[PDB]
C-alpha cells in the first residue's frame, strides 16, 4: 500500500527525447569532428560504426533493458542481481560528483559568453579593453600584419584573461582564488537544473523538449550559415578527406572505441534510471536503436557545422584547416569558432544562439546525470527518503556547487582537464565493464534473454547474445588496457602539467573505485557460513 509502485513517464516521446538529450552534449559537437579529421579523415566512420555496432549498441541496449525490466536505481538493482556489486551504484554516485564539478563550469563559461553577447559590439572583436595586453592584434586594423610568437588574438585574449582569468594562476599549485562571475553563472545553472529536476521525471521530460530540440536548430542555422561562407570547403575537405593508411594505426580504433562509448555513456546508471520509469509493456528495443543513431548522426552533421566555419576561418587565413584546428578543446568553440562567427554579419545573432546552444547541449546531459544518482539513492533508501524530492535534489545540487568551487578558480580550467581525462574516464569504463560482465555472466545471459523474452515477447537474437557474452566486454576491456598502458601527457594554454598530475588523477580515479571492493569485503565478512556458501548466497540474487 501507500506509495507502492513507482511512477511512469508521461508520454513515449518525452523519455525518447530525454534519453536523446542525455546522449547529445558538447562532445557531439566539437569532439567528434576533431578526432574524425585527425584520424583518417572521413575514413574514421568505418571503425566508429563498427565500435558502435559491436561495442556501443549492446551495452546501451543492455543498460536500457535492465532499467525498464527491473525498475530499480543504480544501487537497488544490484541488491536484486549481484549484492556484492551493490557498490557499483555507490561508485557511480562518486563518479557523477567528479563529473558535475567541472561540467557545469563549462556551461558557466558559455553562460558568461551568452550574457556578454547582449552588447551591440562584441567584446572579443576589438583589442581595446581592460583585459588585453599589448600583444593583442585584431582585424579591421592595419594590413600586412605579421603574427608574433608572443602575439595573441582578441578572442584568445578575451577567453584567457577574462572569463578564465587563467593568467592569475600559476598552475595546479596555485589556482586561487575563485572568480565570482562564474560562481554566479554556475549558480544560475544549478538553479535552472534545480527547477528542471526537483519534481522528477515529469519536469525533466518537459524541459528536455526545449533543451534537446534547440541544438539541432542552432546547428542547422550554423549549418546553412557555414555552408554559405566562402572557402568553407577546405574545412569539409580536411574533415572528410579519407586517409586509409591511418586505419592501419592500432590507436585509431581505440579512439573510435572510446569516442562511441563516452558519447553514448552506457553502464552509467543514468540510462538505467530513465528506463526505470517507463512502461513494462513498452518496447525499449526500437528506442535504443534509433536513439544511438541520432547521437551519431548529430555528431556527423555537427562535423559539417564546425568544419564549414572552420573552413571559412581557414579561408581568411591561409588554408591547412589542421593548423587552425590545432588546439582541440574549449578553445576550438570559445576562441576559434567564436572569432570566426565574430567576422560574419549579424554576429550578435549567431553568437547568442551558439553559446546558448552550448548551454542547451549541457543542460539536458546535466539533468540526467543527476537524475541517475537521485533515482539511485531514492530507490536505495526508500521511505527514509522521498519525504520531499526537492530536499535530496537541493542537497546534491549545492554539493556540486562546493565541488565546483575548486573549478571556479582562476586555474579552474586546469582542473577541468585533470578531472576529464585522469578521473572519470577509466573508472566509468571499469564500472561499466564490471557491470556488463556481472549481467552477462553472473546473472547469466540466458536468464537475461528470458527477461527480454517476457518483456518484448521474443528472445533477443544471437547477435546481441554473442555481443553481451564476448564482444561488449572485450570492447570495454580494449579501451581500459589501452588507457592504462598509455596514460596521456596533458598540456593546456602553453603550460605543461606537472609529472605528479597523473598521481593526483589516479587518486581521483581510485577514490570512486575504493567503495566496491571494500563493499565486497563488507558483504563477504558479514555473510556467515563458508566462502563457497556465503559467496553462492552472494552470487544468488534475492530469492523472492
Amino acid at each position: 500500500g501507500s506509495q507502492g509502485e513507482r511512477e511512469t513517464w508521461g508520454k513515449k516521446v518525452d523519455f525518447l527525447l530525454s534519453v536523446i538529450g542525455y546522449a547529445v552534449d558538447l562532445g557531439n559537437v566539437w569532439r567528434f569532428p576533431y578526432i574524425c579529421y585527425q584520424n583518417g579523415g572521413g575514413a574514421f566512420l568505418l571503425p566508429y560504426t563498427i565500435m558502435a555496432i559491436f561495442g556501443g549498441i549492446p551495452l546501451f541496449y543492455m543498460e536500457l533493458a535492465l532499467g525498464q525490466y527491473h525498475r530499480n536505481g543504480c544501487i537497488s538493482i544490484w541488491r536484486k542481481i549481484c549484492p556484492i556489486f551493490k557498490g557499483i551504484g555507490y561508485a557511480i554516485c562518486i563518479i557523477a560528483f567528479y563529473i558535475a564539478s567541472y561540467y557545469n563550469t563549462i556551461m558557466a563559461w558559455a553562460l558568461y559568453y551568452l550574457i556578454s553577447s547582449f552588447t551591440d559590439q562584441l567584446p572579443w572583436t576589438s583589442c581595446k579593453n581592460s583585459w588585453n595586453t599589448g600583444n593583442c592584434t585584431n582585424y579591421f586594423s592595419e594590413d600586412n600584419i605579421t603574427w608574433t610568437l608572443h602575439s595573441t588574438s582578441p578572442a584568445e585574449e578575451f577567453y584567457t584573461r577574462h572569463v578564465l582569468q587563467i593568467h592569475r594562476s600559476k598552475g595546479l599549485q596555485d589556482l586561487g582564488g575563485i572568480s565570482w562571475q562564474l560562481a554566479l553563472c554556475i549558480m544560475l545553472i544549478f538553479t535552472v537544473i534545480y527547477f528542471s529536476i526537483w519534481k522528477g521525471v515529469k519536469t525533466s521530460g518537459k524541459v528536455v523538449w526545449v533543451t534537446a530540440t534547440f541544438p539541432y536548430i542552432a546547428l542547422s542555422v550554423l549549418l546553412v550559415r557555414g555552408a554559405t561562407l566562402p572557402g568553407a570547403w577546405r574545412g569539409v575537405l580536411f574533415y572528410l578527406k579519407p586517409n586509409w593508411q591511418k586505419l592501419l594505426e592500432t590507436g585509431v580504433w581505440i579512439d573510435a572505441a572510446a569516442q562511441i562509448f563516452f558519447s553514448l555513456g552506457p553502464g552509467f546508471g543514468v540510462l538505467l534510471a530513465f528506463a526505470s520509469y517507463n512502461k513494462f509493456n513498452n518496447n525499449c528495443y526500437q528506442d535504443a536503436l534509433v536513439t544511438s543513431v541520432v547521437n551519431c548522426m548529430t555528431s556527423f552533421v555537427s562535423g559539417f557545422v564546425i568544419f564549414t566555419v572552420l573552413g571559412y576561418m581557414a579561408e581568411m587565413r591561409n588554408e591547412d584547416v589542421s593548423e587552425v584546428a590545432k588546439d582541440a578543446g574549449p578553445s576550438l568553440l570559445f576562441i576559434t569558432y567564436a572569432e570566426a562567427i565574430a567576422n560574419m554579419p549579424a554576429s550578435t545573432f549567431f553568437a547568442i544562439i551558439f553559446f546558448l546552444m552550448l548551454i542547451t547541449l549541457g543542460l539536458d546531459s546535466s539533468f540526467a546525470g543527476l537524475e541517475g544518482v537521485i533515482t539511485a539513492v531514492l530507490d536505495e533508501f526508500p521511505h527514509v527518503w522521498a519525504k520531499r524530492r526537492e530536499r535530496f535534489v537541493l542537497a546534491v545540487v549545492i554539493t556540486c556547487f562546493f565541488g565546483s568551487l575548486v573549478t571556479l578558480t582562476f586555474g579552474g580550467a586546469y582542473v577541468v582537464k585533470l578531472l576529464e581525462e585522469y578521473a572519470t574516464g577509466p573508472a566509468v569504463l571499469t564500472v561499466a565493464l564490471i557491470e556488463a560482465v556481472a549481467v552477462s555472466w553472473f546473472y547469466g545471459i540466458t536468464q537475461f534473454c528470458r527477461d527480454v523474452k517476457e518483456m518484448l515477447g521474443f528472445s533477443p537474437g544471437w547477435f546481441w547474445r554473442i555481443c553481451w557474452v564476448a564482444i561488449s566486454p572485450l570492447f570495454l576491456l580494449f579501451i581500459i588496457a589501452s588507457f592504462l598502458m598509455s596514460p596521456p601527457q596533458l598540456r593546456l594554454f602553453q603550460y605543461n602539467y606537472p609529472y605528479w598530475s597523473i598521481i593526483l588523477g589516479y587518486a581521483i580515479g581510485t577514490s570512486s573505485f575504493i567503495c566496491i571492493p571494500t563493499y565486497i569485503a563488507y558483504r563477504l565478512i558479514i555473510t556467515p557460513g563458508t566462502f563457497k556458501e556465503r559467496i553462492i548466497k552472494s552470487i544468488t540474487p534475492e530469492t523472492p
Partner: antibody
Amino acid sequence: EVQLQQSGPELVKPGASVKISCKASGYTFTDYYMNWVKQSHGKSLEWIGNINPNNGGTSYNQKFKGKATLTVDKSSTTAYMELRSLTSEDSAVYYCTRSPVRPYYFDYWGQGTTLTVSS
Amino acid sequence: DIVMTQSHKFMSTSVGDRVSITCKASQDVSTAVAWYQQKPGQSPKLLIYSASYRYTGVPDRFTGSGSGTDFTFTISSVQAEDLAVYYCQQHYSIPRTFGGGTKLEIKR
C-alpha cells in the same frame, strides 16, 4: 640590421656527427621561429624543420625526422642543428633562416655552411 | 604533402625584356606563395609573399600575381645584377616545400 651568422665549413667522415651554430642579431630573438633549410648541389631548397625559441618546441619534417635535431639557447641567442649518420647525400649547403608564425616566409637567411662528408 | 613544380628549369630573357616565371603547386593554395631570389654564391633572398605582396627592400620592378595552384613572378625591367635563380614556395601546410627552381639566363 638583422644578421644570421652561421658556423664555418666542416669536413667530417661518414658515420660521425656534426653540429652547426647560428648566431642571430638585429631583432628580438624570442619573437620568431628559427628554421633550417638544406640545399643540395644543383638541387632545390629543402626545409628541415623549425624550432620555437621560447620553449624549444621543435616541428620537424617527416623526411628529416630523426635525421636532424634542433636546439636553441636564449642566453646567447643562438640556434643549433645536429646531424647523425652522415652519408654522401648529407654533403650540401645548409642555411638557418628566420621566419614568423604567419604568414610563413623566410625573410633573413644565414650565409650558409658548406658540409662535406668524406673519408 | 605538397609538391611545388616549376616546369621550366631554364628561361631565356634579355635585359629590359618582360619575363614571367610560372609555378605549379599540388593543390589549391588560395594566395600563399613566396618568391625567393638566390644569387650565385649568396643565400636565398625573399622577394614576394602572399603572391601579390612585396617584402621590404625589394625594388618596384619585381611583381607577382595569381590566385590558385598556378602563380606568376613578373619582372618588367631585367638588369645585369638581376641574374639569379628564382624559387617559388608555399606556406600553408606542413611540411613547407620548394620548387625545382628556374635559372634565368640573360640573352645579349
